[PDB]
Structures are given as structure tokens and as C-alpha cells.
Amino acid sequence: QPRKKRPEDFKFGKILGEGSFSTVVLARELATSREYAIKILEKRHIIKENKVPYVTRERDVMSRLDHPFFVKLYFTFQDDEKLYFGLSYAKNGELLKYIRKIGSFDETCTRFYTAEIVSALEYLHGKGIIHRDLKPENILLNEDMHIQITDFGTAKVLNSFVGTAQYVSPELLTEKSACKSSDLWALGCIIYQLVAGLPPFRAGNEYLIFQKIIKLEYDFPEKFFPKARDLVEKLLVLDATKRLGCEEMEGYGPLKAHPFFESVTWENLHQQTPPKL
Ligand SMILES: CN[C@@H]1C[C@H]2O[C@@](C)([C@@H]1OC)n1c3ccccc3c3c4c(c5c6ccccc6n2c5c31)C(=O)N[C@@H]4O
């Protein structure tokens, strides 16, 4: 394998984002000119906050990801005080950004982008890994406009966690548990948000949001594409074992077979050219 890389091999640039225990900075490797998104974490802050298991799990899960719709971990290293993860750089940023720019997606884009996510989850769940905090802010877009799902610091590899309020599944609020269906629930929310322009469960604070979630309290606007609406209702189901896509419902075949995906060719999605937004 190559020599361990170090800080001096890069020319760090702008900050792409900040997390609670980390900072992601765009860096260009001097010897190759390649751009990487480097996640930086302070060893002391992690130990003081008892996050070692979390950072470790994050690195282990990312090291197993080998698919075009997911972030790729190219390398890691550390100096006396910090940990460095070398990640693939998704130049176009958050999907949420596009959602806001154009308000909402027409049908061709909703279908294309939902298909990529479904295809990514099928690959993720096939390795027995669950994200647990899937959302438009975590789904990035590469230079070609294909998705790049990242942020695995909250993943579970087949109850100690609750992601973003608006995307939390009901089982998480009434059992502290979570599984593949939790991601499918988040998927439903995301599909609803692509078509409507906003997530299904909204309210003044988290308590009120959690309240609507457990009572399955949301509704579709008049325009909502019929087939997408049907898919969403089969995803936003209170009983986790009744969601289209889960093992009890027989997996991904039935989900990918949904009428909404009728015209979709699942086989080579990352080869296809994305519809313009
Ligand atoms: C809430 N959105 C943030 C957007 C911004 O910073 C964050 C922290 C968040 O992306 C999920 N962020 C991460 C968090 C955890 C792991 C990896 C990343 C990451 C990558 C990237 C980016 C990024 C690229 C372009 C604009 C904003 C970006 N942000 C990130 C990243 C990236 O390109 N590769 C890493 O996966």
C-alpha cells in the first residue's frame, strides 16, 4: 500500500461543513492535484465526549462502502491531536439545496433521484448496515449530479440514538429501536419532500413534530403525482414490518416493482445522465 499520507501532503482550502465533533475541509493533494473532502476530528474532544465507539464505527462502515452512490473512504491518518478521513468530494453539495432552488422536483427528476436512493439503500441494507439519519442534507451530489450518500457517524451495523426530528420513524419514538425500515420511513419523507417541496411532518418544535409522527398526521397537496403518492403511503406506515422494501414485505424487488418506477432501468443508474433540474 502507499505510504501513510500526512497533513503536509495537502493544501487545505475552504470548510465544506461542520458537525458536532468534526469539520470537513476541501483539500487538494499536492503530488496528484486530486481534491478530497477531509473529515477532521480532535482526539481529545472525542474521548472527553465518549465518542470513540462512534468514530470507530463510522470509519469501519465507510471502509466497507464500495458503491457509486455512496461516499468512498480513500485514506486516514493522524497527527498528535487530530484524526483525518480522506473522502470523495461531491462538488455540488446538498440535495436540499436543489430542492430549495427549484422549489420542488417535477416527476422525471423525483423518479430518477428516488430510484438512485432506493438503489443505494438496497446496496446498503444488503451489507446489513443502516444509516439511521437519512435526509436531503446527507445526500450529496457529485460533479455529474449523481447522489453521494454520506455521514455515517450514526450508522448501526447489524437503540442509542435519534437522528433528525423530521425524519425519525415512529418505532424510534416508542421503542428506542431501529432497523432497515427506519431508513425506508426516511425515504418516504424524502420522496414527499421532493414532490411537495417540504418534509411531511412540520411543527413549532420537536415535541410537536414527534407528536404528528406517531399519529401519522400529515397530508398530501392536491398536485402530488398519484403514483408517487401511493408509494409514499406504502412507506409512511406506522407498523415497521409493513413498509414496502423491508424483509417482512419481501425486500427490494416489490419496492423496485412499484408502478412509480415503471420506466426505470435499475441496472445502470449511475451510467445514465440525470434529468436537468
Ligand atoms: C448537513 N450537510 C453538511 C454539508 C457539508 O458538510 C457535511 C458536514 C454535511 O454533509 C452531510 N459533510 C459531512 C459530514 C459527515 C461526513 C462527510 C461530510 C461531507 C462530505 C462532503 C461535503 C460537502 C460537499 C460540498 C458541499 C458541502 C459539503 N458538506 C460535506 C460533508 C463531501 O463532498 N464529501 C464528504 O462526504
Swiss-Prot record:
Lineage: superkingdom: Eukaryota
Subunit and interaction comment: Homodimer in its autoinhibited state. Active as monomer. Interacts with NPRL2, PPARG, PAK1, PTK2B, GRB14, PKN1 (via C-terminus), STRAP and IKKB. Interacts with SGK3 in a phosphorylation-dependent manner. The tyrosine-phosphorylated form interacts with PTPN6. The Ser-160 phosphorylated form interacts with YWHAH and YWHAQ. Binds INSR in response to insulin. Interacts (via PH domain) with SMAD3, SMAD4 and SMAD7.
Expression across tissues: Appears to be expressed ubiquitously.
Modified residues (N6-acetyllysine): K223
Region of interest: PIF-pocket: 41-85
Recorded domain comment: The PH domain plays a pivotal role in the localization and nuclear import of PDPK1 and is also essential for its homodimerization. The PIF-pocket is a small lobe in the catalytic domain required by the enzyme for the binding to the hydrophobic motif of its substrates. It is an allosteric regulatory site that can accommodate small compounds acting as allosteric inhibitors.
Residues at which ATP binds: S20, F21, S22, K39, S88, Y89, A90, E94, E137, D151
Entry's localization field: Cytoplasm; Nucleus; Cell membrane; Cell junction, Focal adhesion
Induction: Stimulated by insulin, and the oxidants hydrogen peroxide and peroxovanadate.
Similarity field: Belongs to the protein kinase superfamily. AGC Ser/Thr protein kinase family. PDPK1 subfamily.
Record note on what altering T273A does: Abolishes phosphorylation by MELK
Gene field: PDPK1
Entry protein name: 3-phosphoinositide-dependent protein kinase 1
Function: Serine/threonine kinase which acts as a master kinase, phosphorylating and activating a subgroup of the AGC family of protein kinases. Its targets include: protein kinase B (PKB/AKT1, PKB/AKT2, PKB/AKT3), p70 ribosomal protein S6 kinase (RPS6KB1), p90 ribosomal protein S6 kinase (RPS6KA1, RPS6KA2 and RPS6KA3), cyclic AMP-dependent protein kinase (PRKACA), protein kinase C (PRKCD and PRKCZ), serum and glucocorticoid-inducible kinase (SGK1, SGK2 and SGK3), p21-activated kinase-1 (PAK1), TSSK3, protein kinase PKN (PKN1 and PKN2).
Species of provenance: Homo sapiens
Active-site residues, Swiss-Prot/TrEMBL: D133 (proton acceptor)
Modified residues (Phosphothreonine): T273
Modified residues (Phosphoserine): S160
Protein kinase domain span: 10-261
Post-translational modifications reported in the UniProt record: Phosphorylation on Ser-160 in the activation loop is required for full activity. PDPK1 itself can autophosphorylate Ser-160, leading to its own activation. Autophosphorylation is inhibited by the apoptotic C-terminus cleavage product of PKN2. Angiotensin II stimulates the tyrosine phosphorylation of PDPK1 in vascular smooth muscle in a calcium- and SRC-dependent manner. Autophosphorylated; autophosphorylation is inhibited by the apoptotic C-terminus cleavage product of PKN2.
